[PDB]
C-alpha cells in the first residue's frame, strides 16, 4: 500500500455486489478513483455509495445494464477512466469485451485475449494441458456428434463416464451415465439442452472421478514472466456442482503433493503465457493423484482466504501486474500463515433441494464484525432487496485462526452472531457441515452433502442435553417476558400489586413431545426443572435485542427470538436451527385438552 | 384627493356585481339567484351588515396577479344580519368569481365570521354554491379548507349550524356541510359528490350523470346525507327562514318558547 | 428498545414509481418498540390499518394508509374504523401517530350512494377534536381533501413530518394541469413544469404546513422525542354537554 507507486488514478468497476464492494475498497486503499455502474434499481446499492461517481448503465435486467457492453463503453469515454476491472461473471471472461477495451487507449485489468480464448472451451484446454505436461482426466479428446460414438467412448473409457457441455459453465450441463443405454439416453438429452440454452452442442465424454476433491491453486503472474503458484484452497462441499464452503489450506495435501500441484499449475501457466491473477482447479482422487480440470481466468469468488493464509491482496497485485510494474514476491517468500474457514451466506432455503432461491426485502442485518478472527465481505445493507435478476447471494463470511479447530470454532461463533430478518438463508446448513463429524476429521469428499444428508436436510438433530438446555432457555425467557410485563410506572391512584409468584409451572410442548417445566427466578438467574433434570440460566435478558447471549450450567449460547405470540408460540433460532415451540401454563394447558381441534 | 374616494366607489361597484354582468345573466338563465340576492331574501330587510367587502385573494401564480383577474370579495359575501329579530352570521358562495372555488381569502372571510359567531354565541348559515378549490392556489386552498373544517368541529354543540346547497359543490366542498347539524339541498340546481362523473367513468368505467350521482333526490332519498329538499330557491330560504325560528341560538339558551294560541 | 434506534432498513423501502405499492406494516413494525404491534380489525377495511404499539414504553395509537390494497384510498369502511379507533384513543389519553400515503377517496357510485360525504366526514371530525398528542409522517402522497382528513397540521396537529417522497397537491398533476391549462391547450412543457415545481413536498415545507423534511432512518427517534415534550399537552375548548358527530 505504497502511495508513491504510480498506478493508475481512474478504475471503472464493471461489476456489482460484493466484488464490487471489495475492488472499491481496494481502490480507495490505493488513492485511485473509483467509478461504478449501476442499474436503475442498484442505484441505492452500497457499492454506488462507496464510490467516488457513478453512472447508470440501464434497467434492471444484466442483459441490458450489465452485459451492455456499449452503455459500458459510453460510461468509459464520459468518465475517462484509465482502468477497468471486471471482477468475476459477467463481462469478465469475455474476449470481445477485451477486444472493445484493446480499441480504446484504456486498459483491461486481467488476462490477455488470447489466454482467455485459451481457456474458454474445455477441449482445447485439456489439448493444451496435455501439450503442457500436466496430468489430465482421462477420456477422449475430440467433439462426440452421435450415440453411438459416446457409447463407444464409453467401452473403451469404463462404464462411468461423465457427459459435459464444451465451455459453459456455471454447473450445468454436466451428467453422469453409468451404463451404455444410460450413455446413449444422456447424450441425446445433454444435445439438447446444450441447443436449449448454451448453443455450442459440442459435448465431452470422459471418466467420472469416484471420490474426488476439488483443489485450487491460485497463480499469479505479471508481464516479464514471472508466476507464483501461491497455496491451495479445498472446495469439497458442493450442491448443485458449485461450491458453498471453502477451505484454504488443504488438510488432505502434504508438502510435496502441494509443491508438485503448485509447479505443474505455474508450468501451464507459463505455457499460456498468462498475465494476471487466476486459478487452475485438480481433482485429487483417494490415491493422491491429481488430475487438471477447467482454468478461471478471472478472479476467484473464494480468493480472500488464500489472501489471509498468505497475507496479500490479490486485487492490488493484479492492479500493479496491468500498470506493467513486476511482481514484488518469489515463490520462497509465500508461506503459509494459518488456517482460514470461508462460507457463502446465500438467500435459499436449504430445506429444499439443498437451497432454493429466494426473494425478498431485508428487514434486519447485522454482521459479526466485531467477532476474533472475523471477515465479512457483503455488498449488502438494511433495505436491501433480493430479486430474481441477480444471483441471491447474501455475503461471504471468513475466518483465520492459528489452525483448523480455532478457525472453525470462530466460524461457527459468527454464524450464530449472524442477524438476517426478511429473507430465508442457508445459515443452518452452513452450521450443520462445519460441526459435522466427517467435516471436523477432513474426510470429505464433492458429494458430502449428498451422502451425509440422503433424504435431504433436515435441520439439527438435538441432543438430550441440547434439548434440555434449548426447553430451559425458552422457560426462562417466557417467564423473563412475564415478569417485564408487570412492570409500570407508579399511578399514585391506583398503586400496582405485583402477584407473588415463586415457581412457574409450564407445559413446553416441542417436536410432537410435551415437558413439563418449573422455572424459579433469583434476579438474573433462573432455575429450571425440565423432566427432574436441573439447569441454571444466567443473563442479562435484554428482551429488545435481536440476539441474546445466556449461560446454561457455564456453557455460553448465543440464541435468537424470531417470532413470540401472546398463545405461548415461539420461533428460537438456537445452535442454528430454527425451534417452534409452544409454552402454555400448567392450568392453561389442562383446560387446553377440552379445545376441538380444527 | 377625489381618487381615494373615486377607487372606493369603483371597487364598491365592482364588488356588488361580483364577477360581471354577463355571468350574472348565465347564473340567472340556469335558474339560480345570486349571492347577494340570496343573502337578501334570507335576512330581514335592512338588516344585512357585510364584512371583508374589499378583500382580495393573493395569488401570484399562473398569471392570477393582472388585474383582469382581480375581484373585490373574492366569490364569498359573508356578514350578519336578523332574523325575525334574532341574530344570525352568514356566508354566501358566489359561483360568479372563479366559479365560487375557495381561495385562501374566501376561507380567511368564512373563518372569521365563524370565529366572530362562536364569540358572540350566534348560529351560523352557509350558503354553498361552490366549485371545490382553486387550483391555482395550490396547497393553500387545502389549508383554507382545513381551517374551515376545524372550526366546525369547534363549533359543533356550540352553535347550530345550518348548510343550504343551492349549487354544485364537488370536491372538498362537500366536508362542510357534513360537519354541520343540518343540510338542505334545491331540487335540480344543487349537486353533491366528492368526485365528477368524467373520473367515475375514468376509474369505475360507468354512465352516470350529475343528477344520478349527487342530485337532491339522490342525497334526500337513499344517500341519507341531505334532510330536506326544496323546489326552488326562493322555497327553499322561506322554508329556510321557518326553520331558523325553532332553533335556539347557543346551547348556553333554552329551548325557545313562542307565543301559544 | 432504545428510543434513538436508527431504521435505516426505511431508506429505501418506498419505491421511486408511483404505481408500485410498498406495504405499511414493515413501516410500523421497523418504528415502534421491540417490533410489536397489536393490530385492532386486521381482516376488514384493510386499506387502513389501526392498532395499538408501544413507542419507549408508552402506549400509542397508529393509524395508516395501506397502499396495498386499493393503493390506500379511503372508503365508507375504513373512515369508520379509523375514526372510532381515533375516538377512543382520544378519549383515553393516548396518543396518536399517523402514517399517511393516500390518493384521495375512492370513486363509484357504490360509494356515494352509500353516504360516502357522512362517512369519511367521521374520520375528519375524529382527528379535529382530539386533544391527545398527534404525530403525522407523509410518506408519498397526500391528494386534497384525504390530505386534511388524515390528521394536517390545520387540524391543530402538534409535529407534521415529510419523506423526501411525499407529494402534497390538491390533486393530481394531469388533472391540475389540463384544469389550469385548458385554455392555453399547451400541455407539452406544462406537465414538466408542474411536476418539477409542485410534485415535491417543497410546497408545503415553504409555508410551514410540514415542520421538517426527515431522513426515513431518523423516523423512530424524531417521534420519540416529540412524545417527550408533548406528554404535558394542555388544550382548552368551548364549553358544551356534547358536540354532534355524523353518525
Ligand atoms: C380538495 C378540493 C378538491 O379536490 S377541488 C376538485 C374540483 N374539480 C373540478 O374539476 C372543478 C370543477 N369541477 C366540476 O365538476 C364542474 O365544473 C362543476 C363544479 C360541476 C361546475 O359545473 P358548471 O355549472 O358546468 O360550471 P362551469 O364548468 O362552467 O365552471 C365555470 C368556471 O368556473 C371555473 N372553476 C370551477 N371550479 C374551479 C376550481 N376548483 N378551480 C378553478 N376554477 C374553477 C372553471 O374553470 C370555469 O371557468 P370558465 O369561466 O367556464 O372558463
Ligand atoms: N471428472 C470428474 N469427477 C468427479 N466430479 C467431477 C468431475 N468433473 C467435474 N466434476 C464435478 O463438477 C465440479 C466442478 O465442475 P466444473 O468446474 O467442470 O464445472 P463448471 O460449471 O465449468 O464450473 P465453474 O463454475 O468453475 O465455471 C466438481 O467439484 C465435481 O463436483
Ligand atoms: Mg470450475
Redesign the interface.
Known sequence: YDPNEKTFDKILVANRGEIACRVIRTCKKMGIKTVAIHSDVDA?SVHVKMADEAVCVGPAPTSKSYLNMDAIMEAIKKTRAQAVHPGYGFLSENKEFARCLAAEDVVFIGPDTHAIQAMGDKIESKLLAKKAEVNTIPGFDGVVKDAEEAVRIAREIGYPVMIKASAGGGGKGMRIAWDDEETRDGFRLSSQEAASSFGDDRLLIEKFIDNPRHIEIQVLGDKHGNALWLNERECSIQRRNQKVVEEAPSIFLDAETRRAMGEQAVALARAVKYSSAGTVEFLVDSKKNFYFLEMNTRLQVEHPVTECITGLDLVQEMIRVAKGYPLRHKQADIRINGWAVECRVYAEDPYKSFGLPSIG?????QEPLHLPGVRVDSGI???S?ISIYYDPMISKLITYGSDRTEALKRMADALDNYVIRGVTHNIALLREVIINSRFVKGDISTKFLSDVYPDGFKGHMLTKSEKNQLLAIASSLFVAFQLRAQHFQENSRMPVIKPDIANWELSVKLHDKVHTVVASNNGSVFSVEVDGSKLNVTSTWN??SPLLSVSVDGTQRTVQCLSREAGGNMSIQFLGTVYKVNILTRLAAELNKFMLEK | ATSVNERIENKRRTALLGGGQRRIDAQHKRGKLTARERISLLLDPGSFVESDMFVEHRCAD?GMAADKNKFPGDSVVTGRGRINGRLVYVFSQDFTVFGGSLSGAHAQKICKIMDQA?TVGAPVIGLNDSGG?R?????????G???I??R???????IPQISLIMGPCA??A??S???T?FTFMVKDTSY????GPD??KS??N?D?TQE???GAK?HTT????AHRAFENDVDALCNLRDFFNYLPLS?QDPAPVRECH | ??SDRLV??????VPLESTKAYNMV?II??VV??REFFEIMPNYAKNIIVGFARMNGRTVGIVGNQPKVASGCLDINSSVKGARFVRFCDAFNIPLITFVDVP??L???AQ???????H??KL??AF??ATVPKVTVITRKAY??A???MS?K???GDTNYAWPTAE????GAKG?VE??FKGHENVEAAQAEYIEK?ANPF??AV?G?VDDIIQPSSTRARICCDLDVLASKKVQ??????????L
Open positions: 441505492s426485502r431485508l428487514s434486519q442485518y445493507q438494511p433495505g432487496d428482551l429488545a | 399562473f362562536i378549490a387550483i391555482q392556489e395550490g396547497v393553500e386552498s387545502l389549508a379548507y382545513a381551517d373544517f376545524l366546525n368541529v369547534t363549533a359543533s354543540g356550540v370536491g372538498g362537500v366536508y356541510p357534513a360537519l347539524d353533491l359528490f366528492i368526485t373520473v367515475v376509474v369505475t360507468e352516470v344520478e350521482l349527487g339522490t337513499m344517500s341519507g346525507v346551547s | 428498545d432504545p435505516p432498513e426505511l431508506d429505501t423501502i414493515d413494525h421497523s418498540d421491540e384521495g377517496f370513486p363509484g357510485t356515494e350512494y352509500g353516504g360516502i360525504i357522512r369519511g366526514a375528519l371530525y379535529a377534536e386534497g381533501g390530505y386534511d382528513v394536517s390545520h387540524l391543530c402534497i397537491a390538491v390533486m391540475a384544469i389550469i409542485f410546497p408545503a409555508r404546513f375548548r368551548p364549553w358544551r354537554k356534547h358536540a354532534n358527530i355524523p
